[PDB]
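User: Good morning. I'm curious how N-9'-methoxynonyl-1-deoxynojirimycin would be positioned relative to this chain. Could you predict the structure with it bound?
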Amino acid sequence: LHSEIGRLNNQSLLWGPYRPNIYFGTRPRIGKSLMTGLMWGKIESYTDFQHTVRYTCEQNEGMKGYGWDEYDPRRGGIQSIHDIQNGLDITTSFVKIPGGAHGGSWAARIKGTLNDDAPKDQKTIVVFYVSQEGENSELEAVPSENEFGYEGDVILKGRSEALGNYKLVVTKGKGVIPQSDHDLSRLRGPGQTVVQSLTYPDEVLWQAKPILFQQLKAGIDWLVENKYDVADPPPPWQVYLLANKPGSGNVHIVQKVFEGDFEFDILFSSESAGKEVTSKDLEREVKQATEVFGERFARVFDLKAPFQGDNYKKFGKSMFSNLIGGIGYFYGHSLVDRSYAPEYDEENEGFWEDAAEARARHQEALEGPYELFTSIPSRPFFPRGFLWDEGFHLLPIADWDIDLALEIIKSWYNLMDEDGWIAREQILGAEARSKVPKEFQTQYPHYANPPTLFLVLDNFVERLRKLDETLSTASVDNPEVGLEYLRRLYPLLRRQFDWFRKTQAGDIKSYDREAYSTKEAYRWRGRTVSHCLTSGLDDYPRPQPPHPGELHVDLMSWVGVMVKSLISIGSLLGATEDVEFYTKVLDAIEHNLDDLHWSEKEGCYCDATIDEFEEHKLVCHKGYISLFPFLTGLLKPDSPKLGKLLALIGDESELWSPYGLRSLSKKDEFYGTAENYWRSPVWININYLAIVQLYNIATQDGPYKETARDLYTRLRKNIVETVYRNWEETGFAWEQYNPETGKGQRTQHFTGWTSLVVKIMSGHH
Ligand SMILES: COCCCCCCCCCN1C[C@H](O)[C@@H](O)[C@H](O)[C@H]1CO
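Assistant: Good morning! Here's the predicted structure, ligand included:
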């Protein structure tokens, strides 16, 4: 029944619009298979279309905004795109229709409406691009009846081992098709839907834009060769309309030109399912998905006061739908330096120069292929898996669909190597690499990232202790299924725990250091003079200079998180020998947090280093790092230390801004310096941890119950209102928020952990 829920999950999740790096496209969760993507652009001249055409996600002045209004990867959703450059409001609806043995069928409607500013007679070129990777597979456009192209629907018939037999239809659509009265129309037709069927080596099929443009370019060269010239030139839209040549191939380009508003459907029919999908099915299934989305949201994300209003509901739906709508499937090789050069041990003073020397050996090589099914922080800027981000992403997603979240956790853990390492940043395949300067592709087996995926596991454990409907909660509702999941995952968690303690160990013994335990002390590897990228808090101030004797209190707290999880999970699996070891580790971290990291003088936790005179010194920089044992749930609710931490949190002159907690205190010497990334701005992920911890203390007997209640109430409100106000005014989630002005800044479309706001509004932690 665990093998069974698994198969049912696989079949349900197989198809999706799982290409968030592009405006709209589909692919199944199979490395080498059938992919689609949409392109569009206005054409006003002989040279403009190359600049107007849209394919991969971006954000600039030419794009008002875009995103998912509604989304559930089992059912589908509706995306809306507000394109200024192209004077178009576009809607792409996607729906899955279960049936057969190959993961079912799906349909999409593409709808374009010119905005008020666009010329009423705008010509827009629209391309549906279809590619198929695999050695023993086939795809063929059924030729037209007409001589120059298609009056009606374009049918592609194809087959592969993975998908069996299928048909993909691009429907005729609705809208004016311009007609050219030029001489060229005698050889090219007056204007109609066209299809080119081509083949390239599999590994380049993702390059849809260059491949399209190469075909457009060949058509223009034919014009020149055949005496079509500036003395009497065809209209632009006809110059850029491909000559029809349907056939067999692994690439099929379907092109339409419309004048004014337009729409057309894409109908994927899995043959093994029986009756093929129609446009009427699409409409019915689209209405039904919306109804189901609506019912689930109201239930799962029941927004509490003072955010019960309709405005907050629309806001929460946008934030949530963009988070879960970012889910992608990525496949291909990763770039990894497997030299384990000794310079990477960072055991000496000045280690960063040595590590630079090793990296300059460039021993990195491609390995894999790997796959990953994950949500992402940023469609336009970094559409790929980041390890500690995903832990936050899955917190609202798990509420919605725990089986989906567990599927993503599993996907991430399947990347763990033999030592216990998962690369913190997952750049899988040439397509993912295209978006990443080469200097930034290499992953390093000594670089960690916070184990926030344990927080998701913690939530599932609590739920376990206490057809698409059934599927989403099968792993909690059948306790047998849940436990088997944990049983199979558990050794990997254990392995990652051991990996942290082996590779990210700090040095107690070599120095004049005294502490309850000789073992518990941690130091993030990979730090440079101005950064610590592995911790997640890029440029938060750390001991200067970096030093092999540094200890990082956030890292110790994360190990605290993992060991607590391993206690709950080990206990469920009856790993008595394991649970006893974990229990002594936790006790030791509890003591060493105080012994190595507590500053009585400052009233907070601090990272530690080793002096010019070889002595332990605390280095205090009041901000998120200072709060870490509190943020990660490690302190007792009557701890006097927790009480001082609450004072720091609520202190307006330190961390407390009207817009949320500042990443660094206004009193710190490093406040608003350098790139000022984590040196003052309000970040939603850390604020979320604070809010959740305040609520815990607020809902429990103790001396700080009422302080916590007040801070909970205000912080929740301040964070939610800041994200809402910015969303209302800009249409975006932002990466971080200015604590002086309240403005969203850095990158837009950050959904992304900013989307945690849905769960903050929902409350009842
Ligand atoms: C150098 O430039 C070339 C590469 C550019 C792309 C860099 C990837 C963007 C990272 C964004 N972001 C920075 C946060 O401090 C991290 O905590 C967070 O995990 C990460 C992902 O959301």
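The first strand starts at residue 15 and ends at 16. The CA atoms of residues 297 and 597 lie 43 Å apart.
Let me know if you'd like a different ligand tried.
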